[PDB]
Amino acid sequence: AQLCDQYATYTGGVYTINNNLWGKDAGSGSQCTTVNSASSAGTSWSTKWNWSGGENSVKSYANSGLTFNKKLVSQISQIPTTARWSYDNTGIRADVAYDLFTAADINHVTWSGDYELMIWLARYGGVQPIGSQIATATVDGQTWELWYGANGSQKTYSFVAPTPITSFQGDVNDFFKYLTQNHGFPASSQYLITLQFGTEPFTGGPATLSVSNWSASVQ
Ligand SMILES: C[As](C)(=O)[O-]
Ligand SMILES: C[As](C)(=O)[O-]
Ligand SMILES: [Zn+2]
Ligand SMILES: [Zn+2]
Ligand SMILES: [Zn+2]
Ligand SMILES: [Zn+2]
Numbered sequence: 462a463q464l465c466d467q468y469a470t471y472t473g474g475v476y477t478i479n480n481n482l483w484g485k486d487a488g489s490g491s492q493c494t495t496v497n498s499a500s501s502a503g504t505s506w507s508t509k510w511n512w513s514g515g516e517n518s519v520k521s522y523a524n525s526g527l528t529f530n531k532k533l534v535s536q537i538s539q540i541p542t543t544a545r546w547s548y549d550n551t552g553i554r555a556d557v558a559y560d561l562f563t564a565a566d567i568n569h570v571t572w573s574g575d576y577e578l579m580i581w582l583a584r585y586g587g588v589q590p591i592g593s594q595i596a597t598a599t600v601d602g603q604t605w606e607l608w609y610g611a612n613g614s615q616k617t618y619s620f621v622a623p624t625p626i627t628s629f630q631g632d633v634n635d636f637f638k639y640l641t642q643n644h645g646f647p648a649s650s651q652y653l654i655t656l657q658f659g660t661e662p663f664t665g666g667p668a669t670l671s672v673s674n675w676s677a678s679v680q
């Protein structure tokens with residue numbers, strides 16, 4: 462079965478695939494996510510959507526999320542991850558992104574945090590992260606735009622690739638180390654509680670994100 466409903470979900474091994482149409486009331490449209498495979502090594506899935514209205518509101522974040530042992534960011538050694546994906550229609554206003562949450566309480570709900578770390582592998586149509594650009598950051602020898610904004614109790618750092626990274630390999634912990642070292646991130650008192658990869662559509666379509674593989678571990 463496709464996952465078409467707002468919070469339709471599938472779990473396989475340590476990967477959970479969510480349609481997660483959290484912003485569906487902000488516009489008009491539809492979106493269904495298909496799971497291809499999910500094992501202990503990785504997952505493959507796709508999502509297809511069309512959205513209009515609410516030009517600057519995210520409509521959804523269909524994603525694959527990892528089940529892992531939650532732990533303080535200061536005790537993470539590495540978060541090796543790969544993401545191989547493509548969009549068929551790039552004439553859209555959307556991002557492709559990792560989404561991570563941390564909190565001071567390990568038992569915080571997993572859909573929000575004290576902090577949110579996003580890693581945008583792609584930006585289409587000029588859509589912008591939460592907040593404003595505060596820096597240009599070098600991480601693992603690649604340059605990223607670094608944005609910061611806050612909404613209520615949630616503070617969001619977003620690292621943005623200058624060109625789409627359709628075959629990503631990296632260590633997400635490099636980004637936490639960057640924030641710890643350069644932006645006073647409180648690593649020794651924040652637990653990593655969520656690690657996801659997916660796409661945020663604003664407008665456009667029909668368009669399909671095909672994720673040929675996503676793999677992650679928190680070690
Ligand atoms: C130095 As700042 C813009 O991260 O307070
Ligand atoms: C040292 As700073 C908190 O202004 O990134
Ligand atoms: Zn239904
Ligand atoms: Zn909170
Ligand atoms: Zn808190
Ligand atoms: Zn707080």
Ligand SMILES: [Zn+2]
Nearest residue numbers: 595643644645
């Ligand atoms: Zn700072």
